[PDB]
Design goal:
The structure is cut from a larger assembly and holds 2 copies of chain A, 1 copy of chain B and 1 copy of chain C.
Chain A lengths: L11 E2 L11 E6 L9 E3 L7 E3 L13 E6 L15 E2 L3 E2 L53 E2 L5 H11 L17 E7 L5 H11 L6 E6 L5 H22 L3 E4 L4 H14 L12 H6 L16 E3 L2 E2 L8 H4 L1 H4 L2 E2 L4 H5 L12 E2 L15 H4 L2 H9 L16 H18 L8 H12 L12 H4 L4
Parallel strand pairs in A: 8-13, 9-10, 9-11, 11-12
Antiparallel strand pairs in A: 1-4, 2-3, 2-5, 3-4, 6-7, 14-15
Helix pairs in contact in A: 1-2, 3-4, 10-11, 11-12
Chain B lengths: L2 E8 L2 E5 L21 E5 L2 E5 L12 E3 L6 E4 L15 H8 L17 E2 L18 E4 L4 E4 L9 E4 L5 E2 L5 E3 L9 E4 L21 H6 L7 E3 L9 H10 L16 H8 L27 H20 L4 E3 L4 H13 L17 H7 L3 E2 L7 E7 L11 H6 L5 E2 L4 H5 L12 E2 L1 H13 L3 H8 L1 H16 L7 H17 L13 H12 L2 H8 L5 H4 L3 H7 L8 H16 L4
Parallel strand pairs in B: 14-17, 14-18, 15-17
Antiparallel strand pairs in B: 1-2, 1-5, 2-4, 3-4, 6-13, 7-11, 8-9, 10-12, 16-17, 18-19
Helix pairs in contact in B: 5-6, 11-14, 12-13, 13-14, 17-18
Chain C lengths: L1 H25 L2 H19 L5
The chains are: A alpha/beta, B alpha+beta, C mainly alpha.
Function (chain B): Produces ATP from ADP in the presence of a proton gradient across the membrane. The V-type alpha chain is a catalytic subunit.
Protein name (chain B): V-type ATP synthase alpha chain
Keywords (chain B): ATP synthesis, ATP-binding, Hydrogen ion transport, Ion transport, Nucleotide-binding, Translocase, Transport
């Protein structure tokens, strides 16, 4: 609550006698007007300390600068009472409803659990789509990345399938007793426009009535921004991990994760190693895709989903490298795809959930899915060859057998991949594949077994 | 046990005075809660401490307590079957004390005294000791753990507790100069366990894996490396490795591994099919796996772990075999650590350290002797596999700097569903050179001459497929195809050794040998046939040859008998044109 | 073209990348060199502030 | 003895009161355990003297650990007993054989003789290897840069000519009265096999009964790699000039020399300038070969044979680059010969020595060598040039203008260059060196006269 502030940079502020404080803390600071702002507790040395004002900066004076000690580490209140609440960045009551009932003020970062507990996520999951459930599904707790474009229909295709998602234990042989549906979404650096496109999907159909919001606009303060995700992130845990519910964490443009980052080191003196960024991102970032998985004994499992855009769609950047290193999959979007009108414009092989190849098929989703999942993959792409070779010979200039492998691709991207807002049940989604496969007389598919095709086909 | 007081708190890094004259890099247990740290560049009455642990809630001047003693490993029996992490923390004594989550600044001895060992005092009081020497043995799982004395130990022995139940802590013996001595000990990772002599890497290593060793092996305790994309059941090789491998000792240091990917191994690991003890191979195994997001230097010590430790047992004359998948990412941590320090990522954006710890990292291999003077397998495998399928990159073109054997896997060769899909034109092992000698020596005088001989496949294949890959069996005279026809069997029968199945999975040299042979003795006459007048697309329809494809699948015992007929079966299965 | 492509095309664009790269990676010269000097200042200031 | 220890860094650290101690001398420091090591005395400023950390930057402490002035500068003794002895690291007869007491203890750094008393080489290094002594060889007094590769036939190659090399005076001038091929050896960041490898090459020729054996362990004191260098050097100086012995010492895989040596200035704040490398790299390469050469009238002839693999395989790197100017000439293997079957796998692309001109051709050797020097050059070169466009238009699209230079590329290929351990002398070599130009007419060539062309056609 002291005064005498020396050395002030932007939303930063130093204060002596910092032996009562400790890095990892925050308190509200008051200049002259007595305005209540804030500031994180950094460098608590003998001489002075380091604080980071919530707001941008304007409002710090030389005379007064006392501070009301909030709490070394602050954490929002957790509970099951948040089935439609709304919060931004830090995550404070903006939805109008009463301050969330605090159950336990857990650290926004409880770090990973016993690695011995962690199990392989293999509970099949639908998303109201075909292509994104057949060729590449998503297993419970599986941290699946989504390579998006920095200005692509991302923002949309994001929240689009968001609500579409629906967990189906039924097909496995269980009910929704221990398998509840919990939707958590948190963005950052959002345009005033977009900040409004979001709030829309929830209000659509029974979407917000079972979810909580979080998103620190880029114009907002850069402080809550970083942690912004960690909030509901650490909070989803109390859901599936503490009670055994089933949560879905979905990142959003880590552009923020790093832009915001730069400031921390840019001030903290944290020298940026490669690509002009902090020489300890891997680590700090790792702690991210760790909040997803499964433990021995608990069925409750939260599924994790990263989603970001590169600087110029360069995978050589951290934004991609990092992920493409810890994430168990890959799912990008191409200009091409969308240019023709494909929506969702999602490529084939370029996108795929690394660990959704085992949690499918027998018992899980559609027995024959086992081989069905690797059929349309090698079979489809096979046609993408006679797709750019028209100018070579022509339409009828090509054989029947291989030419046929063409009509497929077009009927495949236009109808199969571009599925817009539609919501295809995990089963309504598998059928389609079959249907398309009919192009080639029963006997041309070398991927699946004659057994399965000689039936579903 | 050097204590002290905190002066400053800069997020992760720390500073504290009241401690002067402490060694560099040691225990460093800052934080009231005795947290995880490391002593660095000192200054005046204080020094720098690197605190990885969440540096949140740190009041200057906290329970600054270090030992001024390097981070070293807890030597001694037990570790086998035992669960450990990045540094050396029993992730299982953890689950049992944390319950579910991961508690910080916590600690549990690698080997709680709760363990009651029954050694045997093979020594006597008042005897001669040599820098770590003979000591006493313990009935470990399947193998009798040989507990021997560590270094600096030269002189007299006093008091020897005879047989009986005693834990690793029970000071069995003592020296007639002071101190005492137990079963387990403590040794710094940064240092290796000198044995006496490294000797000539003559003794050939049978990793049991066909393509692996028949083509390119490693005396014992060599140093190898492999690519592969990230994952791709890459774990396959390293796994089967220990299964067959002619090493009794299994290490393993998964490091900075993809959370859940860091575990699939862990769950499927226990499932051992040990071919010697016939059952859970878990008996002669060591665990260390370390998630990526683990502590800062966690992943960085990971490696050092198995290696350092390997030395303990090795030094005793044991066949250690360390691997650790996700090694390639391992460096990750090194950048993180060296990043935050006045260091410009040399060569390819990465700390200059290369022939650094990496180099020496291997020198702890080969034909180590022992404290007592014995041979000990210390094979190293660089489970270094870039998750982005790279060919030139620090991690790689560095390793290559120094190794011994390279087992390149090709993404395509695999993409076909080929196992093993080890791409050879891209593999090597310098060992063969000096191992060839022993090859014919013990195995068969004419053994090598076959392998080096058949190898011509690639020789007359590399530049044969090339043009002929598209064109194919066409403008070819005839003998043209025969050359790639054989490769076909050699690559679909001989090469491929689906290490998955039990039949061709396990195999010994003299087994694979007949295989390669059966295809040879059929070749020396096969080409003499189309050159004398016999058909091409005819020879190729003989069921006699198909019996070759299975030679690998053949049981190592009937192989011989299966050879007697099969082989001679050719001499007469060919006499028809 | 195949051949050429393979020795001028392929290798033409290969060789490009290297030159770029090595300049691109080292480019982070200023990172260390600029920042190196940077520490001395921020600290010299805070190093001479505890000596005056 | 002074216990001035107030700062501590991985490298050297603050040390005062030792300002009267010799500068850059040899000092010893007991970790305050008894454990003691060395270092150099650099920046002996009254302001604060700093000391060269050898290894394990650890163990050192502010309390104990004190220094001991042993010598003012690089020094150690060299007696004749040193024949076939082995002093790995810093030159210590670690081996197992009792470190004999040196006859004469002198400094190792030393500086090149006088550029005035430096004779010109006449004698020719005659080795059972045509390939070499043909295009480019040596006068036993010129250093040439050998570039191999990581895991490349560097041992075999340097080995071959190792013993298979002899000296011919009959054509040169001098006789066989004072010629001791004594060759020590220094291990600079050697490895397992590469080390245990040159082992026998002596025990087989006896080369181990008249040479010193400096080693590096490649894990021993990183700094050691920069110590055995200047040590190894002076070594020859004693027996070379002092005893008039042509003592020739060739260090090994000097790669780990630069390799490690470069990392020095790292935390040493040397501010690299080149490609991530020390802005003073060449600066060290000074004493490197600046000590090799030949003396006027003096029978001492020392000359280091640089043999070290370049990075991946590009000379772009200074590793080999800086080598070019410094070292006379530049020879390589192009890793194309051996990778295919050529042994010696040396390529004529960069091969060409700086002292090959003066002391060859006539008198010294076959008078038509000097003439056929270049003939071969333009002949082979344009040879492959051809094979290039061949697969580019079809093996057939050329005339007699190519069908002849073509076969010129094969004959020279594994036909001439390769040969294995074959011991081809300068006689046998050139004798047939012409049997290759048998096809090429006297007109198609214009490099040599019209007399030597008909000499041995």
């Amino acid at each position: 609550e002291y005064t005498g502030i020396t050395y002030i940079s932007g939303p930063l502020l130093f204060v002596e006698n910092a032996k009562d404080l400790a890095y990892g803390a925050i308190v509200d600071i008051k200049d002259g007007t007595g305005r209540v702002r804030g500031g994180q507790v950094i460098e608590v040395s003998e001489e002075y300390a380091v604080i980071q004002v919530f707001e941008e900066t304007t409002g710090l004076d030389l005379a007064t600068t006392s501070v009301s000690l909030v709490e070394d580490v602050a954490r929002l209140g957790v509970s099951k009472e948040m089935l439609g609440r709304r919060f931004n960045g830090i995550g404070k009551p903006i939805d109008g409803l009463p301050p969330i009932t605090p159950e336990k003020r857990l650290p926004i970062t409880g770090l990973p659990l016993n690695p011995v507990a962690r199990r392989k996520p293999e509970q099949f999951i639908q998303t109201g789509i075909s292509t994104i459930d057949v060729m590449n599904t998503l297993v419970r707790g599986q941290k699946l990345p989504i390579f998006s474009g920095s200005g692509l229909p991302a923002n949309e295709i994001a929240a689009q399938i968001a609500r579409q998602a629906t967990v189906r234990p039924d097909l496995s042989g269980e009910g929704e007793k221990e398998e509840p549906f919990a939707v958590v979404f948190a963005a950052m650096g959002i345009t005033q426009r977009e900040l409004s496109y979001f709030i829309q999907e929830f209000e659509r159909t029974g979407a917000l009535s079972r979810s909580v919001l979080f998103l620190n606009k880029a114009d907002d303060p850069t402080i809550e921004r970083i942690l912004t995700p960690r909030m509901a992130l650490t909070v989803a845990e109390y859901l599936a991990f503490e009670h055994d519910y089933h949560v879905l964490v979905i990142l959003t443009d880590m552009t923020n994760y790093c832009e915001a980052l730069r400031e921390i080191g840019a001030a903290r003196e944290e020298i940026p190693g490669r690509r002009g960024y902090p020489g300890y991102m891997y680590t700090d970032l790792a702690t991210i895709y760790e909040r997803a998985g499964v433990v021995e004994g608990k069925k409750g499992s939260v599924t994790q989903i990263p989603i970001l855009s590169m600087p110029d769609d360069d995978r050589t950047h951290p934004i991609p490298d990092l992920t493409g290193y810890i994430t168990e999959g890959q799912i990008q979007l191409s200009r091409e795809l969308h240019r023709k009108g494909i929506y969702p414009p999602i490529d084939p092989l370029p996108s795929l959930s690394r660990l959704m190849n085992n949690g499918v098929g027998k018992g899980k989703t559609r027995e024959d899915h086992k081989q069905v999942s690797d059929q349309l993959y090698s079979a489809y792409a096979n046609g993408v060859d006679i797709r750019k070779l028209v100018a070579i010979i022509g339409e009828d200039a090509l054989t029947e057998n291989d030419r046929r492998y063409l009509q497929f691709a077009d009927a495949f991207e236009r109808f199969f991949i571009n599925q817009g807002q539609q919501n295809r049940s995990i089963e309504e989604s598998l059928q389609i594949a079959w249907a398309l496969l009919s192009m080639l007389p029963q006997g041309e598919l070398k991927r699946i077994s004659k057994d399965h095709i000689g039936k579903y086909y | 046990m050097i204590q002290g007081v905190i002066q400053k708190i800069a997020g992760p890094a720390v500073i504290a005075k009241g401690m002067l004259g402490a060694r560099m890099y040691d225990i460093c247990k800052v934080g009231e809660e005795g947290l995880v740290g490391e002593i660095i560049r000192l200054d005046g009455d204080t020094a720098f401490v690197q605190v990885y642990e969440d540096t949140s809630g740190l009041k200057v001047g906290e329970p600054v307590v270090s030992t001024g003693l390097p981070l070293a490993v807890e030597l001694g029996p037990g570790m086998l079957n035992g669960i450990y992490d990045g540094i050396q923390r029993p992730l299982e004594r953890i689950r049992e004390k944390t319950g579910i989550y991961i508690t910080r600044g916590v600690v549990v001895h690698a080997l709680d005294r709760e363990k009651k060992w029954a050694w045997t005092p093979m020594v006597k009081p008042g005897d001669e000791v040599r820098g770590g020497m003979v000591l006493g043995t313990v009935p470990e799982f399947g193998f009798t753990h040989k507990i021997l004395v560590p270094p600096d130990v030269r002189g007299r022995v006093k008091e020897v507790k005879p047989a009986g139940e005693y834990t690793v802590e029970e000071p069995v013996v003592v020296l007639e100069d002071g101190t005492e001595l137990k079963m387990y000990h403590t040794w710094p990772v940064r240092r290796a366990r000198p044995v006496q002599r490294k000797l000539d890497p003559n003794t050939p290593f049978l990793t049991g894996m066909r393509i692996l060793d028949v083509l390119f092996p490693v005396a014992m305790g060599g140093t190898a490396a492999i690519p592969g994309p990230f994952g791709s059941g890459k774990t396959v090789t390293q796994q089967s490795l220990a299964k067959w491998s002619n090493a009794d000792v299994v290490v393993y240091v998964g490091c900075g591994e993809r959370g859940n990917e860091m575990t699939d191994v862990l769950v499927e690991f226990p499932e051992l099919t040990d071919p010697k003890t016939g059952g859970p191979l878990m008996h002669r195994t060591v665990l260390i796996a370390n998630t990526s997001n683990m502590p800062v230097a966690a992943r960085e010590a990971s490696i050092y772990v198995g290696v350092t430790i390997a030395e303990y047992f090795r030094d005793q004359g044991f066949s250690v075999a360390l691997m650790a998948d996700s090694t390639s990412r391992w460096a990750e941590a090194l950048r993180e650590i060296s990043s935050r320090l006045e260091e410009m990522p040399a060569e390819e954006g990465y700390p200059p350290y290369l022939a650094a710890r990496l180099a020496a990292f291997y020198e702890r291999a080969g034909k180590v002797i022992t404290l007592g003077g014995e041979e000990g397998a210390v094979t190293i495998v660089g489970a270094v596999s870039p998750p982005g399928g790279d060919m030139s990159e620090p991690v790689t073109q560095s390793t290559l700097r120094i190794v011994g054997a390279f087992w390149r896997l090709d993404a395509s060769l695999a993409f076909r569903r080929h196992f093993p899909a080890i791409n050879w034109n891209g593999s090597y092992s310098l060992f063969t050179s000096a191992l060839d000698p022993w090859y014919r020596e013990n195995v068969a005088e004419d053994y090598p001459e076959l392998r080096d001989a058949i190898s011509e496949l690639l020789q007359r294949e590399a530049g044969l497929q090339e043009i002929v890959q598209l064109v194919g069996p066409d403008a070819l005279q005839d003998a043209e195809r025969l050359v790639i026809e054989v490769g076909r069997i050699i690559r679909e029968d001989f090469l491929q050794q689906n290490a998955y199945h039990e039949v061709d999975a396990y195999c010994s040299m003299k087994k694979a040998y007949g295989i390669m042979k059966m295809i040879l003795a059929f070749y020396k006459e096969a080409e003499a046939a189309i050159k004398r007048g016999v058909s091409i697309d005819e020879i190729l329809q003989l069921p006699v040859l198909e019996r070759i494809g299975r030679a690998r699948y053949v049981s190592e015992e009937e192989f011989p008998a299966y050879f007697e007929e099969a082989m001679k079966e050719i001499q007469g299965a060919f006499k028809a044109l | 073209r195949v051949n050429a492509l393979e020795q001028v095309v392929i290798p033409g664009i290969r060789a490009q990348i290297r030159f770029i790269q090595q300049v691109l990676e080292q480019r982070e010269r200023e990172d260390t060199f600029r920042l190196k000097r940077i520490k001395g200042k921020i600290e010299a200031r805070e190093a001479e502030e505890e000596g005056g």
